[PDB]
Design a protein around this ligand. Structure first.
Ligand SMILES: Nc1nnc(CN(Cc2ccc(=O)[nH]c2)C(=O)CSc2ccccc2Cl)o1
Ligand SMILES: Nc1nnc(CN(Cc2ccc(=O)[nH]c2)C(=O)CSc2ccccc2Cl)o1
Ligand SMILES: Nc1nnc(CN(Cc2ccc(=O)[nH]c2)C(=O)CSc2ccccc2Cl)o1
Ligand SMILES: [Cl-]
Ligand SMILES: [Cl-]
Ligand SMILES: [Cl-]
Ligand SMILES: [Cl-]
Ligand SMILES: [Cl-]
Ligand SMILES: [Cl-]
Ligand SMILES: [Cl-]
Ligand SMILES: [Cl-]
Ligand SMILES: [Cl-]
Ligand SMILES: [Cl-]
Ligand SMILES: [Cl-]
Lengths: 258, 258, 258
């Protein structure tokens, strides 16, 4: 069942651990590195400089490590990096960084990126994230761990999707989504916290209730942004889980000297 | 002159009626059955167990019969079934069922499914439906006959699109769409009935007027849901066409004992 | 370092200037003409009658010059035309015209059409336009020069996107967008003029201020449409830039005899 299909193209410069597979008609461009036990499906296109970790499954029609088309980037020799145990479904596009930001697009471990999703220049994904069909990260988007972006979720240049956060389908996210928050619609608004994926992480009930309290503070008490960050302080010493939520909201607003 | 391109891959286990064609670089995975007079374009990917009926036209970059990525499904050996005279345009994805629901994703006859559309695990399509570009059925979605989903229509797990119904472009359907109803926007709201595709079916004028009356009852009289189902009763004996509309609304709301 | 890959398929009827390149597994259907210095990536599909100008870059999974699926078109032998210095990113679909309108889909010069974008039957694109990821022109859409459609912008049959206009991401454009106007959301509303791409064109400050005045007139003074066209008259003699804006608004409303 013999590993690297002969109908596939591998650059001499590319370099692949022993038990990597490549389906037919797939291209492994120059400067592409593929870690142990990874599988490249048929009709894939890898371009470098790109570093793909161990035990990844990448499917057909996927164009992983292409240049961003954005005119900003004029071909400077930037990187893409993918961790281990990731799944990249049919037709996904992942673009390498631009020198303008950190010169690298980056994906962690255990992520599920479903069909026709896009991950633009300089975006950065943590672990156990799910990007559903046609989710699109315009560029320099940071997605912290466990986040779930429902189908056709759109995320504007530079937004931070905090951890365990959740976008509903057709969400149009123009600004940061705090840890644990559920957001919906065009343009994205906050609704609740994601109690779902909190029970899934086996959070204590005190921690859940405390996170509801925390939501209520920010949003439904109309404190200012600053006013609420202040309130949470207590809540956040008490519960590392809340801490995260305060910390998300923190480094979204620095504001100016009024 | 030559039917099945030599550059295409056909599993020994696959089985294809005499005058089937397959374009180059297309893969017909194991357990894939293709009925009389069907045409598979170039760069297609079929995976099984999948049964494709007669006189279908499937285009390039289409991944028909892949497993749903949803973690729910752990590889149990489920099915896809496609009827006759269907068209599947460029880049369509169709996923086979999960044992959790009916273990089968199902498509009827005479359907037009346009480019980059998605038909998730366990979805079920009738006949003469049109799914326009990038329409997406999250899973277990039933689309009854003649329905038209305009481009980039999104349909949440388990929703029923009643017959002759119509979604506008970028519709975000979170709940059932009754027979004949036009819905628009994010989130989808009702606007009118689809008089268009009623004239197309050559409905009697009494039947059209009766269907307007019926709409008005449900929606624009603010009867309850139950209250309206009651009203329609008369309307629905009188006109098989209305009957359908009542029947759609019926088995969307069972409610609980208050 | 010999230009047309041997694993690619070229119709004898197709015709390609000397220094054209074609990547592997790409098909150049009959009646396809490709101008000097153009590059066709791997796994592309060209179909004709199609005329592609000079120095274009077309990427993988792109299906350029296929028939529109719309049932309106019954195979009449219509055309696609693409100018020079265009970029067509991964997975783009471009459909040839229908005899019903002008029998031709048309693209000018220096345009950037990003991944998974769609350009339906009879649409018409000027120069230096950017269509971002998954932008979709349903059909007979005219996009005048310098226009920018942010990602997942949807444009209903027959709309005119005036020059330097700008749609935000997930915009759902059901009606004309005047020159220079910024529109956002579902359904698209007007917000501002696109001062951005005005500074980019090096417009005089008088011209910018005059264009703000002009916006204010149409929209924020609630003159009628006709009433405002009247006002602009002066503004529009004075400034060719305004002229454009009046002219966009003009041939969107002919109205009827009341
Ligand atoms: N609101 C809501 N609740 N459950 C869901 C499912 N889901 C998100 C999801 C979560 C986990 C997972 O594995 N897949 C999808 C979606 O994005 C629904 S929309 C969708 C799903 C699959 C394919 C394409 C689309 Cl548009 O949506
Ligand atoms: N408002 C409205 N009424 N009819 C239309 C056309 N249509 C629906 C349609 C009708 C017939 C058919 O054969 N295909 C699509 C659309 O989906 C419009 S949006 C669209 C069309 C083609 C590709 C992609 C998109 Cl976003 O738009
Ligand atoms: N409001 C706003 N202003 N600029 C933007 C960014 N932009 C447009 C853009 C403009 C020029 C260019 O070369 N690339 C992107 C977008 O399409 C944002 S959404 C996006 C971008 C790239 C891929 C996919 C998506 Cl959804 O959004
Ligand atoms: Cl709440
Ligand atoms: Cl409380
Ligand atoms: Cl009505
Ligand atoms: Cl009446
Ligand atoms: Cl009324
Ligand atoms: Cl020029
Ligand atoms: Cl110019
Ligand atoms: Cl440009
Ligand atoms: Cl014209
Ligand atoms: Cl002034
Ligand atoms: Cl004002």
């Amino acid at each position: 069942m013999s590993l690297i299909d002969p109908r596939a193209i591998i650059d001499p410069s590319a370099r692949l651990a022993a038990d990597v597979q490549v389906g037919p008609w797939s291209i492994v461009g120059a400067e592409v590195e593929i870690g142990e036990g990874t599988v490249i499906g048929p009709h894939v296109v890898l371009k470098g400089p790109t570093k793909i970790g161990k035990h990844n499954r990448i499917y057909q029609f996927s164009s992983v490590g292409e240049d961003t088309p954005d005119l900003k980037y004029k071909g400077e020799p930037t990187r893409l990096v993918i961790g281990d145990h990731n799944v990249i479904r049919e037709g996904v596009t992942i673009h390498r960084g631009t020198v303008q930001d950190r010169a690298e697009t980056t994906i962690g471990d255990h992520n599920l990126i479903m069909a026709y999703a896009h991950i633009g220049h300089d975006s950065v994904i943590g672990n156990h994230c799910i990007l559903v069909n046609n989710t699109a990260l315009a560029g320099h988007v940071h997605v912290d761990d466990w986040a779930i972006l429902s189908g056709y979720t759109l995320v504007h240049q530079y937004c931070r999707i905090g951890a365990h956060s959740f976008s509903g389908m057709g969400s149009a996210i123009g600004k940061d989504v705090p840890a644990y928050v559920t957001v919906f619609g065009n343009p994205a608004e906050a609704r609740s916290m994601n109690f779902e994926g909190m029970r899934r992480r086996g959070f204590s009930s005190e921690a859940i209730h405390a996170l509801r309290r925390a939501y209520k503070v920010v949003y439904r008490q109309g404190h200012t942004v600053e006013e609420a960050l202040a309130e949470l302080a207590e809540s956040a010493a008490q519960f590392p889980e809340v801490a995260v939520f305060r910390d998300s909201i923190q480094s979204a607003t620095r504001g100016i000297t009024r």
